[PDB]
Design a protein around this ligand. Structure first.
Ligand SMILES: COc1ccccc1N1CCN([C@H]2CCCC[C@@H]2NS(=O)(=O)c2ccccc2)CC1
Ligand SMILES: COc1ccccc1N1CCN([C@H]2CCCC[C@@H]2NS(=O)(=O)c2ccccc2)CC1
Ligand SMILES: COc1ccccc1N1CCN([C@H]2CCCC[C@@H]2NS(=O)(=O)c2ccccc2)CC1
Ligand SMILES: COc1ccccc1N1CCN([C@H]2CCCC[C@@H]2NS(=O)(=O)c2ccccc2)CC1
Lengths: 459, 459, 459, 459
């Protein structure tokens, strides 16, 4: 009778929860735990995204306002990673003095709720640091000399800091000049909800950088905002988000227990069948449960990081987002296993998974041509094409070219002053596009004439 | 003999109007009613579009002129949903005073036929409203205080409104300042047709908005134009368009009667055949007639809305256009049924409609991956990529990426200051593009090796 | 013996010139006439293109210089079909007076070889014309009043034209103000070849246009350049190009005779075979010769027009180019018949021409959906999308969308202030792209499963 | 026994190095020489690219700084191949005088480490050369007259060079004005590595060019930088790169010997088999070795050029890069032969190489249509479309259009003032896109229905 019982076991282990009900009126409480998971995880992700949008928008808007306030002649768009640049000694002096003077008159210039903030030394003021190579008989060591400009120093009607010997810069040895100050703001765009607003501290540094010593000073504006508590303020949910994140951890933990239970019990059924087969003489793994386990672990980790961020009021959510997003993605891929319970969501799998070896072998072959073209393009067209500046950019450009993106712009971007490089670029681009189109279309006719045989043999 | 008669019925019910003439010299007056419909509906749509183009062009040109007249330092292009922005208290004051002074001197500045218009209170003048949080000890309530600047007030050679206590703004509590005025224009670009021109009333509001309190005031210019009747004017078709719209309603109503008649009579023939089949023991629906009925209803509704708009001289035609366009689209799809009467416009239908279940099943599976990628991309790359700002934008970006659009720009838009987010973005984009290309090409080889069998079985 | 002779005829009429030599050592002097044609026609086209490039470049460079000289605050790029625009009465006055003053001081401002040219009335000077509606009690008639500003009038140290009653404009009735003057230039960039340079006459008109009466004056600069003969000039091939064009006409005329001879003689062989077939009881046309005849006619016409243009020194070559280009295109298509003489350049024709009926039938069906979408998109998204402004633009946008071009930009271009139009635009774009991708891929699986059968039956 | 020995020979000559070990425990020291080659060649290329990036970045940054210092009103972006342009005599004078005055005050304007450099005549100063047509009674000869402006000449408090008769230019005869000067810089961005920095000499020429005589002067800034040795400098690997390049030459020379040895020995085995076949009565070439030999030759040549460049301190690496890149590309293609030793990386070759004749025949046919369209588009749309300016640009535009790139932009770029050219452009673009899409999809259905038969016959 043990053979019949074993056969009934697997006959029950291989059917969908919808059917298992038909066979035994059983309730898949585990499938329910999964629907409640998809709803709770998606809800948490959306709420987290909305709150992050609000905070990030406030910080970025304040940064743009600061750039307009303190950078002289700021266009409104960052030239590069740096905001603006100067090419003349008098331009650099004007930018430095403009930043200092705008800080002096902040209360009459700012449109928002800004005030001066105490520095790390507990004093309202401005710090300017400059670095020079010590001394063309320059040395290799750098000299760092700074002074602290208090509000009393700036407020003197005859300004003495402008005429001081500090601000003679000797630009041929100058490495950089750095201006640091702190500002305190408030977002009143939160009081219309009877919730006390969040006071912010801004640590702004302006760096006038000429490490390159190429005749251009690059001006970087960096604003680091952190959420302090409000001290001087009188007008007229923390546990809620935390309980929700704790429930999410409970559901994704319960799912983690159940899936690991099923995998362990699946290994037990293998023994019985394997031992039974021995006497007379990955399918059991169900690698969707691997995906579910990974997504549960990632959701638990991301929820813990989110709780930690909310608890201590921290504003960088990059790694918390990378866990929650990559776990929600896997949750929706797990919806496909449930969808992949009706027989109709199959039959094309006999090609979608069977072609995978052929495609992966093709990728290995085409990968070597792709690497060779990447190296060639970087070395040759690097100094003449902005899409070939570095190896990673070359790889992205070649990937996009394989997909038809910006071909004419790619051809036209390279100037014709160097005739040899122009001819080589033409040959390079034409050969790459033609060769890869040919290879992709070939791979493909083959994949077809193979499936044809595969499906013929299957029937 | 009833069997023969029934057989002759269906033998007549299944043939084209061109053939039914061969079988009985009958005139398909109903097919004629359809050609006259396609011509009348298309003609009405084109005439409506041309007239709307004229009116909208006049209104938009006047709005651009107003923005140049009243917005200080207007570039010519709206920065965003708002036209321009300021970052300094003195800039905001300059913009406000510039708007007021330009309104004061309108007659000497405008190039067109503009004049002052009476307000809702029947008085030529300018209204300025400002909103402040009541009182950092601010309250949660807002205070709205306004004054009306008449032309006599502005025309005083010593201006007293500039120095009044109204225009001290206390920007840290300011929510917005709003300027409202009315102008009356004429389009003389209609007199060259001996048709009396249309006098317009413009309700212009300039909103200096800093609800965000982020250090930037956004300046919105909104112009609401309505067509009044001309009062002061002496120089040297309404029924026509209305009769045409009424004829359109008659033709699309007659077609509605005939199609509903045929469907009802089609149900009668089903009874006869079904009862006949019972004794010895959607095709009849002709779902093209469903399309014709829907298009007729939409055309009647759109024509009624068009008549209502023309009757009371109203200038917003968004919903009238959405009915007429979506009905003309369905009319041209109904041309395909007539085209689909020759046998040659078939045979490919045996795949165009048979593949539909497989494609729809594929869309269900790929839809879950698409949703997962949408959520992941929004949560991770949202704060760093302008094409991932919100969920709808992420969905559009992913759809476009599946079609090869702006891949290199999408890769390059994300800055590399955050290395973790940069690496994740690279992995995300590469995986999405590769996976979806693989899935689409797979779906496809399958659809082929299936049709092959389907067409083989058919023959 | 007549049967054998007839059979030998066709056996000779159906072989390639290369083979006919193998069968009879015959020289295809006619195939030679064709190679000399491809070389002579291509050479003529290239020479014509180079000379046109030179002339057009000179004229366009002079036009750009004129725009910088006479248009106040010209950016360097035309805003639209018009060069620049103004929105204030004082701006319009400044532009008009700037143009007049720059003309007054031309000799000291121009960098090239420019001088004043006599007008149609044989007098060096400037003409200003203005148009007003006669007289709000305006009439429907226009009044045209002008004055001629001579160089003596402009050179008076107290300028009287500025203060004259002519230049009070009454902008509310103004239609346009037009400034006309003539300049004479020389291209010294032709003397370095010992060829006397070409003196030009420029007829420049500046139109300050406000027909719209929308508060914007559009400023058009139109320069009409014609090649006069040089009068005042002393420094230190016309028959050649003409003889070459005459030889081209001879070769394309000889080819026209021979092809028409062969077609006529081909009809003779049809009679013999057709009569022979009758006794016991397009292939002969060779529609490549139709292409050759059309290309010969077009080349002769284009060469005649080119000779006419060169003879009387005229500078508009639009229709001459459209004949020469479209004839050279057909000449290269005729190279394919010669290439299509080896057997290997066939066998794929059994699908390239057999699929044509199925594709054309598909285009008829998809054409109706394309027209419906064009009308719907124009009527709905016309006032909100710059790619849907008019019907032709909508058709081009839909064609490009079918090919994957600017999808994200097309989605993003439409603003979200109108929620109904935004939702409809999303539905419209998604449905169009999905439907047309589906239809194209379907047409295609069908074309395959058909060729498969076609090629199977062929063997 | 010689038959058995011969059979054993080939049985050994046709197996992979991995297997030959299974058959004889032999060590493929030659395959090792290949892995060490791929690592050494890639390493050399990467190091060369990084060093070139540094040098080129320094030179380009200095050039941008020079353009900002010496070009009046420089925007920051080159208008074209030329940096900026002027259209007025006074603008040209201002630009010339601005360049001279900025050179005079260089020490107080430059941000980097710049100084005056001696000219070719060993004297610090500025040279201005102007060219005029000799003398409208101009001649054909040019007159070149120049003066040398020393620092003493520029430093005189009353400037005499401004008022000299040299700088009256007579613009109607002017060909160009050229300003030449030398500057000496240092990159201190190399001292932070205890490596003495590289002093540079810059040969800057500013050319005010109006060869066109079209009313625009084009201003070219050309900076030629060469690495001199440092003379005045006191602060606080050449053999390494050279030994590495010499080792690379040894490995790519040893590989060249071995591959040529194998090819020669391969020809010996052909004799034995061919003679053996005679008695009773490219595969042997292994054209991968041709690729290896070519890549070895290119690597040796590129390494020699790199050694020559490093030895004499020269900064143009265009041809050295074109050899190293195109050799590294071939090295990665040679990785595919090793990958193509497992049987699985085959079977698709039976189509990837068999389709090549059909595709090449298709390219020959489609090439003639492509050439015809190129000529037609250039001749017609050349003067109206910036993507059709010259034949090469037309070819690139058509290639991109075949791949779906910028279709709507291509359609929209051509203005509608000329209706005939607009209609022809529409017809041209539509016909090209439709025809080439049709031909590519046809080629393709054929390639499939052929492989099907090919693979069927193979089995
Ligand atoms: C071996 O690569 C191919 C693979 C598959 C088909 C064709 C090619 N050929 C044809 C040309 N190249 C194609 C690359 C991708 C699409 C654009 C080009 N097709 S084209 O416009 O019709 C054309 C044809 C002949 C001459 C000039 C242009 C690449 C080589
Ligand atoms: C499983 O997805 C695929 C599905 C079908 C074909 C290929 C792939 N592979 C190949 C690479 N990816 C392709 C995505 C769409 C087109 C661009 C890429 N083709 S490629 O340039 O020739 C290439 C090949 C190897 C390495 C690097 C680049 C995605 C994975
Ligand atoms: C009936 O049209 C189709 C025809 C052929 C294949 C697929 C579709 N479907 C699938 C979606 N649409 C495709 C249109 C062209 C390519 C982009 C879309 N493919 S997708 O990114 O993979 C995707 C899949 C599911 C949901 C969301 C996105 C259109 C409908
Ligand atoms: C003989 O060329 C073809 C080859 C293969 C398929 C179709 C065509 N046809 C169809 C139209 N043209 C297609 C070219 C490439 C893709 C865009 C066009 N397809 S479409 O949007 O669906 C369409 C259909 C009918 C009318 C209007 C538009 C080119 C001719």
């Amino acid at each position: 009778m043990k053979e019949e019982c074993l056969r009934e076991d697997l006959k029950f282990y291989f059917m969908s929860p919808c059917e298992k009900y038909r066979a035994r009126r059983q309730i898949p409480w585990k499938l329910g735990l999964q629907i409640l998971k998809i709803v709770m995880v998606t809800t948490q992700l959306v709420r987290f995204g909305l709150s992050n949008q609000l905070v990030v928008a406030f910080k970025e808007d304040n940064t743009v306002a600061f750039k307009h306030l303190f950078l002289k002649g700021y266009s409104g768009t960052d030239e590069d990673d740096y905001s603006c640049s100067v090419y003349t000694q008098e331009d650099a002096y004007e930018s430095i003095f403009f930043a200092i003077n705008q800080y002096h008159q902040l209360k009459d210039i700012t449109l928002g709720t800004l005030g001066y903030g105490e520095n790390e030394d507990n004093r309202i003021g401005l710090k300017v640091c400059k670095q020079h190579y010590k001394k063309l008989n320059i040395d290799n060591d750098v000299e760092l000399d700074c002074v602290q400009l208090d509000l009393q120093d700036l407020s003197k009607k005859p300004p003495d800091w402008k005429n001081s010997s500090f601000f003679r810069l000797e630009f041929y040895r100058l490495l950089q000049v750095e201006i640091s100050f702190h500002l305190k703001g408030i977002d009143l765009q939160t009081i219309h909800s009877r919730e006390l607003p969040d006071c912010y501290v801004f640590q702004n540094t302006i760096i006038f950088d000429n490490k390159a010593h190429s005749g251009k000073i690059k001006i970087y504006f960096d604003s680091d905002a952190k959420i302090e508590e409000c001290k001087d303020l009188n007008i007229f949910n923390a546990q809620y988000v935390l309980v929700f994140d704790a429930f999410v951890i409970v559901i994704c933990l319960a799912s983690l227990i159940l899936c690991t239970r099923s995998i362990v019990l699946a290994l037990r059924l293998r023994k019985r069948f394997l031992n039974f087969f021995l006497e007379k003489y990955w399918e059991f793994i169900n690698g969707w449960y691997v995906l579910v386990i990974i997504s549960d672990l990632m959701t638990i980790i991301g929820s813990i990081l989110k709780m930690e961020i909310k608890a201590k009021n921290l504003t960088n959510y990059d790694l918390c987002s990378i866990f929650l997003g990559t776990s929600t993605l896997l949750v929706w891929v797990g919806v496909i296993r449930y969808l992949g319970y009706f027989q109709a969501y199959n039959v094309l799998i006999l090609t979608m998974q069977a072609s995978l070896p052929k495609v992966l072998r093709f990728c290995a072959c085409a990968g070597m041509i792709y690497l060779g073209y990447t190296f060639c393009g970087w070395i040759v067209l690097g100094p003449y094409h902005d899409k070939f500046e570095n190896l990673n950019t070359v790889a992205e450009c070649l990937f996009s070219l394989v997909n038809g993106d910006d071909m004419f712009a790619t051809f036209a971007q390279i100037q014709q002053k160097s005739i040899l490089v122009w001819l080589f670029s033409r040959l390079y681009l034409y050969s790459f596009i033609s060769l890869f189109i040919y290879m992709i279309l070939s791979l493909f006719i083959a994949l077809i004439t193979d499936s044809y045989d595969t499906i013929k043999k299957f029937q």
